[PDB]
Amino acid sequence: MIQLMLYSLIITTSIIFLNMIHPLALGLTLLIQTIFVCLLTGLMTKSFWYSYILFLIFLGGMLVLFIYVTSLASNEMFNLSMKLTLFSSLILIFMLILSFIMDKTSSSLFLMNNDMQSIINMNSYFMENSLSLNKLYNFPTNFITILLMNYLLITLIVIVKITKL
Amino acid sequence: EKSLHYLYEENEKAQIRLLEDEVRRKMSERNDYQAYYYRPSVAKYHRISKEAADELEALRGD
Amino acid sequence: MIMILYWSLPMILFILGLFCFVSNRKHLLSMLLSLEFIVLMLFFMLFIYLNMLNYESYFSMMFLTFSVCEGALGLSILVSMIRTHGNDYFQSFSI
Amino acid sequence: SEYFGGQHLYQKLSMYSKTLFLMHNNSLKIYLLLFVFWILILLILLFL
Amino acid sequence: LLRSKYYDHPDGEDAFGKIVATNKYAVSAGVAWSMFDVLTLSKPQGYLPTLGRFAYNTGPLMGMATAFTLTTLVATNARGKDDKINYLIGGFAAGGVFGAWKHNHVAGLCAGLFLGIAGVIKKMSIEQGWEFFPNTPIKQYGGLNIAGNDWTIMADPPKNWTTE
Amino acid sequence: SLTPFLRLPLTDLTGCLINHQTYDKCGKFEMKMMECFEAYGLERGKRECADLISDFQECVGMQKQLMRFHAMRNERYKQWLKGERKGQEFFADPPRVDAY
Amino acid sequence: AKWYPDPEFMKQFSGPVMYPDEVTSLWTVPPWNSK
Amino acid sequence: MFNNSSKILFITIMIIGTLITVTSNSWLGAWMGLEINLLSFIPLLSDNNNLMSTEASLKYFLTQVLASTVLLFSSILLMLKNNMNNEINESFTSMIIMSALLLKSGAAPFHFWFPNMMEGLTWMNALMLMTWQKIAPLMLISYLNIKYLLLISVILSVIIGAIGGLNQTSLRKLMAFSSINHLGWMLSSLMISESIWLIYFFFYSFLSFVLTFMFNIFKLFHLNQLFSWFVNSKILKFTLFMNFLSLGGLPPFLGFLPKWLVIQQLTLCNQYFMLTLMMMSTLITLFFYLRICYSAFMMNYFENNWIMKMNMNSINYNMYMIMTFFSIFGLFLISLFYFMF
Amino acid sequence: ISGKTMRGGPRVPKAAPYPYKTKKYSVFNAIFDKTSKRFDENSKVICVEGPIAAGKSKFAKELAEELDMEYYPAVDLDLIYINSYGYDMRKLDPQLPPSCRSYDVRNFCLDPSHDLAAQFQIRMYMLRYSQYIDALQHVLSTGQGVVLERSPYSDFVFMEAMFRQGYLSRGARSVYNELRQNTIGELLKPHLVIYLDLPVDAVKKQIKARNVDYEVQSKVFSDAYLSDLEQLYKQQYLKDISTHAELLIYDWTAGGETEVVVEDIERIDFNQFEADIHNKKMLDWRFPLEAEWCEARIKYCHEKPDLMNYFNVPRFDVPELVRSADDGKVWRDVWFNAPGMKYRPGYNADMGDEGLLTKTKIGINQGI
Ligand SMILES: Nc1nc2c(ncn2[C@H]2C[C@H](O)[C@@H](COP(=O)(O)OP(=O)(O)OP(=O)(O)O)O2)c(=O)[nH]1
Structure with missing residues (x-):
């Protein structure tokens, strides 16, 4: 049910993202889309680690650059329209009552949670967020995360050169 | 006799060229031999990952 | 079918973000924000793929690192024209 | 002969090169929009 | 009905499948050219002249297609012979129709010569039995020593399959 | 899996990144496909090894099981809309909460 | 060896495009150091 | 382009990222390498002295990230349909993958960014x-087995890349349009072999190094700038301009060899009409190559008289004259070659 | 800048002088040998500008020997017409066609209305532009400052001066403006500019006092040409260069004193312009990093063929700057079959060179 609520909220924020043109308003629409995307990717998974990782990296880490650039880009304020708010509310109530009149068992995702797994599954009882993150720090896939940290340092070296400081 | 020898050499080269064209066509039709027309798909990385996952079962403990 | 009921919505919103990326009624900052919208939809679809497998979800912070470096690269490209094209280049409707 | 020959071939190629330079005087968003439509028909047929 | 090909039946056997096949090829070519037309050169504004340019660039190609197919069927059924000069007459007719859209008499024949040449070459392909774009019988996926080119540092674990 | 064009030292890290070999419901199916791709290669493995391909795709892709589930749920709703099944017997005996 | 390329011959290469039209005749050449 | 050691660092990391792309055994590690190559090719193609290079880097960024996200989306879609990287019967998701690759490569339905970006660069970042x-x-295009997309791309590349270079009098856009036509010969070789493509690409690369070194050392960006170029002996200017006839595919010089191997392998693969469509549309490429060769094939010109000394680099032109010799006398080495077979 | 009198001795270098005339400076040489380690207060570029009769060679010589810098002399067209072996190419004038003969400033002094004069000024620019980079290679690679009698920033004054008297057409102005707009943005502006002010009559007085045989009995130095150039200096070139370079007006109508202008130079504080990053003065020499300093040294010590190949503008619409093809052919057959320039310099065995069978040393920034 709440997965369908997040579907409806993402649809509504995407169509208002298509409608609006003010750059900080699109930045605000992105920062409120990232929360719903984080929660909706939290519904399929065993545990909410990667939603937290996407949260710190994308919203609190990266989009603040977008919010700063779009804040200094536009001198003017938002022109709030009650027509777009009314249309968003109408399509939101329509999509929630459409989720009310729809069977939620067929519309639920087939991806297993931590409790949707079998009871006799030995690997699920060990430690939360342990076996999924294991391949980051084991042979031979540790070279990718070493290359990722090197890639981030090289990215900073690129950014200092292209902005010319 | 020089022209006879050169014609014999060129005719035998023609037969070997036709035969290797036929052999290459039958090799590319079926992708059978391991020299040409063969894409080597290896499961070395899958076996390495399976051996690592079997090795980390012993490492599981306290 | 399976595609109609599962993972149909990330495709539709990906095409909507692609059309917002390339429309002539928008500007360069709107292109970059719609680009990070399709980055978010790509994360959604990639996580739906990666959760059919049990313990390969660690790839989600690899694509995150690459696309966040792409976004910082695009912002640093776009603001490098401030000292050359002026502060009015953000309102450019054409390239 | 030069019509259905080299002179008229050169004139037609010059006209085709002049009318293709008008394709390349547009913004990048038009060509990226053409790519987005080519993805769009390639995904409509995936439904069908 | 809409999946009918041009050569699923012999010449003069059915008309409607040939009209649908040649017209759907003309519609595909006209839409593919018109999508690159109205965004790049002579860009219109509004819903009406955009659809007008789409009709102006697609419908004449449909007229060329149906005129070539109709005079090809007329030249095939007017006699007992099924040969390449019926395709020559059809190419001349399609070039003459194209000329009318151009409004130039010279353009119509000049087009009919090349379309008749294309028609007799395609009828030669039908008669002799070869294809314009065949599948490749040979496709070199790589050169020699393709098994000894594995320059990898990782040691191979022992395989689970044998040849015995 | 894709055969890379070049086999350099730089494929050693990328190759192990995604694979059902780490504990999974049916990575032992995928191994039975993958060694088959060592036997016939990639292109003869598409033809001579088609039975082991469909089992792995059936297992992790979950295509026909979900299609059968949707066929069993849409037929029940069609019987509800056609008046054959109605009332408190619309849904059957539910499973126990620790059954699966 | 009697005719050599005159400046009239290299006049046609001096434009912004090889074959000017009503759109590209008002264009200007790029700077010769390409910056 | 060697003003800093950081550019050498970006060159070796873009080499590393390209080698990660072409050796990836999955469709996602190839995208990882594509992003590494993109990160290291954004600061090159950007400079402070040239104003157009920054907006050209913006065009490159938008074109590549549009193509890379469609490449990622279609690869994830393929993995969602069938969970192996290959596909038994080819479908529309491989078409989206190949179209996203063609936007990266610059095939003629998606090539319109290529000369428009090339109009404001230097001759080493173009190289x-x-x-x-x-x-x-192009090394990822070889993994797919659909024919009609390659057919449309090859045909459109050899007509559009040859006709569109006629109006251009700038040397960079003309070389971009010539590389678009030489791209189509590479994709026509990709449908029949993965080795004849390497032959054509290596010698096309060789011709690109030796021909773009002529315009980089002497700083030539225009067709009229070639007529005012001062060479102390006009026989040397006539000899140095034979690389255009070499790259156009003329039999005594090198550059006839890879085109000839493509002709030999395509006729053996029973593809005759597409070969005729390419070779009737490669004469226009030699026509705008011979329009460059107006400035050297005649033996005397109405030169501007203020410049009387030819100024040039030493190491770069020392590397240039080795490769100019093998561009026109390189057909003697066909007896030593064994990589055609 | 500190003089020798207050310092009590000669200046000391902060590092070893790089042999910039022998060894190239690429990025692999820029990894080891840094270039900001040898810079001090006496690393400025000083241009001593003035009218044509003012004493500037003697003043620049005593300023170079007083401030411990290197004096770069004024350019003259003997640098083209005399090769490296010392042979004069003015003796090839009967062999050359009359549209391609020699034209030095002596031929300008007697015949200013000749068609080669519009070439001649451009040639003068090609000797100022080639000198300043040769000045800049002394600043960045050795750390010693340079002083120049003439600069390429001030060469357009002579161009409009010959235009106003009527010696140049409008097309010559257009092609010189195109060459200047193509080239002047690639070299760093000087730190300091000295203008030795002279009235128009005292210039004529010093011209007749010098008694050079082509300056006398020449109609070029009238009361309009000298007045045009001294006006054009102070209201175009000085106003352009004062945004970057410090400008010192000195009343040189007397004999002129040297210690007072060294005192006037020494009270100028050179560190106050580096406080503001976006300041217009000394903007071209404001390199915040060592990598930008090494890039600036690479641009003039290694990329001088690029800046000399930037003179490749095609402009064929002028008839007096286009060498005809038969005249160009016989000019090549005369000039490049000379004893001096049959081959490249250092490899001509006809004029006394030995050991050519084992010699593969080209040289650095050598005209071919
Ligand atoms: N046409 C032309 N003549 C020039 C140019 N530069 C200098 N001259 C001529 C004009 C005068 O005859 C003479 C200028 O004299 P200088 O500036 O060399 O000074 P001079 O040597 O007289 O004194 P000084 O060395 O400064 O003490 O050379 C130039 O760019 N163009």
């Missing part, structure tokens, strides 16, 4: 663009 940056998409 990186038409040679090394064509490695990463």
Whole structure:
């Protein structure tokens, strides 16, 4: 049910993202889309680690650059329209009552949670967020995360050169 | 006799060229031999990952 | 079918973000924000793929690192024209 | 002969090169929009 | 009905499948050219002249297609012979129709010569039995020593399959 | 899996990144496909090894099981809309909460 | 060896495009150091 | 382009990222390498002295990230349909993958960014663009088995890349349009072999190095600038301009060899009409190559008289004259070659 | 800048002088040998500008020997017409066609209305532009400052001066403006500019006092040409260069004193312009990093063929700057079959060179 609520909220924020043109308003629409995307990717998974990782990296880490650039880009304020708010509310109530009149068992995702797994599954009882993150720090896939940290340092070296400081 | 020898050499080269064209066509039709027309798909990385996952079962403990 | 009921919505919103990326009624900052919208939809679809497998979800912070470096690269490209094209280049409707 | 020959071939190629330079005087968003439509028909047929 | 090909039946056997096949090829070519037309050169504004340019660039190609197919069927059924000069007459007719859209008499024949040449070459392909774009019988996926080119540092674990 | 064009030292890290070999419901199916791709290669493995391909795709892709589930749920709703099944017997005996 | 390329011959290469039209005749050449 | 050691660092990391792309055994590690190559090719193609290079880097960024996200989306879609990287019967998701690769490579339905970006660059970043940056998409195109997309791309590349270079009098856009036509010969070789493509690409790369070194050492950006170029002996200017006839595919010089091997392998693969469509549309490429050769094939010109000394680099022109010799006398080495077979 | 009198001795270098005339400076040489380690207060570029009769060679010589810098002399067209072996190419004038003969400033002094004069000024620019980079290679690679009698920034004054008297057409102005707009943005502006002010009559007085045989009995130095150039200096070139370079007006109508202008130079504080990053003065020499300093040294010590190949503008619409093809052919057959320039310099065995069978040393920034 709440997965369908997040579907409806993402649809509504995407169509208002298509409608609006003010750059900080699109930045605000992105920062409120990232929360719903984080929660909706939290519904399929065993545990909410990667939603937290996407949260710190994308919203609190990266989009603040977008919010700063779009804040200094536009001198003017938002022109709030009650027509777009009314249309968003109408399509939101329509999509929630459409989720009310729809069977939620067929519309639920087939991806297993931590409790949707079998009871006799030995690997699920060990430690939360342990076996999924294991391949980051084991042979031979540790070279990718070493290359990722090197890639981030090289990215900073690129950014200092292209902005010319 | 020089022209006879050169014609014999060129005719035998023609037969070997036709035969290797036929052999290459039958090799590319079926992708059978391991020299040409063969894409080597290896499961070395899958076996390495399976051996690592079997090795980390012993490492599981306290 | 399976595609109609599962993972149909990330495709539709990906095409909507692609059309917002390339429309002539928008500007360069709107292109970059719609680009990070399709980055978010790509994360959604990639996580739906990666959760059919049990313990390969660690790839989600690899694509995150690459696309966040792409976004910082695009912002640093776009603001490098401030000292050359002026502060009015953000309102450019054409390239 | 030069019509259905080299002179008229050169004139037609010059006209085709002049009318293709008008394709390349547009913004990048038009060509990226053409790519987005080519993805769009390639995904409509995936439904069908 | 809409999946009918041009050569699923012999010449003069059915008309409607040939009209649908040649017209759907003309519609595909006209839409593919018109999508690159109205965004790049002579860009219109509004819903009406955009659809007008789409009709102006697609419908004449449909007229060329149906005129070539109709005079090809007329030249095939007017006699007992099924040969390449019926395709020559059809190419001349399609070039003459194209000329009318151009409004130039010279353009119509000049087009009919090349379309008749294309028609007799395609009828030669039908008669002799070869294809314009065949599948490749040979496709070199790589050169020699393709098994000894594995320059990898990782040691191979022992395989689970044998040849015995 | 894709055969890379070049086999350099730089494929050693990328190759192990995604694979059902780490504990999974049916990575032992995928191994039975993958060694088959060592036997016939990639292109003869598409033809001579088609039975082991469909089992792995059936297992992790979950295509026909979900299609059968949707066929069993849409037929029940069609019987509800056609008046054959109605009332408190619309849904059957539910499973126990620790059954699966 | 009697005719050599005159400046009239290299006049046609001096434009912004090889074959000017009503759109590209008002264009200007790029700077010769390409910056 | 060697003003800093950081650019050498970006060159070796873009080499590393391209090698990660072309050796990836999955469709996602190839995208990882594509992003590494993109990160290291954004600061090259950007400079402070040239104003157009920054907006050209913006065009490159938008074109590549549009192509890379469609490449990622279609690869994830393929993995969602069938969970192996290959596909038994080819479908529309491989078409979206190949179209996203063709936007990266610059095939003629998606090539309109290529000369429009090339109109404001230098001659060394162009050398990186038409040679090394064509490695990463084209080596992934060989993994797909659809024919009609390659057919449309080859046909459109050889007509559009040859006709569109006639109006251009700038040397960079003309070389970009010539590389678009030489791209189509590489994709026509990709449908029949994965080795004849390497032959054509290596010698096309060789011709690109030796021909873009003529315009980089002497700083030539225009067709009229070739007529005012001062060479102390006009026989040397006539000899140095034979690389255009070499790259156009003329039999005594090198550059006839890879085109001839493509002709030999396509006729053996029973594809005759597409070969005729390419070779009737490669004469226009030799026509705008011979329009460059107006400035050297005649033996005397109405030169501007203020410049009387030819100024040139030493190491770069020392590397140039080795490769100019093998561009026109390189057909003697066909007896030593064994990589055709 | 500190003089020798207050310092009590000669200046000391902060590092070893790089042999910039022998060894190239690429990025692999820029990894080891840094270039900001040898810079001090006496690393400025000083241009001593003035009218044509003012004493500037003697003043620049005593300023170079007083401030411990290197004096770069004024350019003259003997540098083209005399090769490296010392042979004069003015003796090839009967062999050359009359549209391609020699034209030095002596031929300008007697015949200013000749068609080669519009070439001649451009040639003068090609000797100022080639000198300043040769000045800049002394600043960045050795750390010693340079002083120049003439600069390429001030060469357009002579161009409009010959235009106003009527010696140049409008097309010559257009092609010189195109060459200047193509080239002047690639070299760093000087730190300091000295203008030795002279009235128009005292210039004529010093011209007749010098008694050079082509300056006398020449109609070029009238009361309009000298007045045009001294006006054009102070209201175009000085106003352009004062945004970057410090400008010192000195009343040189007397004999002129040297210690007072060294005192006037020494009270100028050179560190106050580096406080503001976006300041217009000394903007071209404001390199915040060592990598930008090494890039600036690479641009003039290694990329001088690029800046000399930037003179490749095609402009064929002028008839007096286009060498005809038969005249160009016989000019090549005369000039490049000379004893001096049959081959490249250092490899001509006809004029006394030995050991050519084992010699593969080209040289650095050598005209071919
Ligand atoms: N046409 C032309 N003549 C020039 C140019 N530069 C200098 N001259 C001529 C004009 C005068 O005859 C003479 C200028 O004299 P200088 O500036 O060399 O000074 P001079 O040597 O007289 O004194 P000084 O060395 O400064 O003490 O050379 C130039 O760019 N163009």
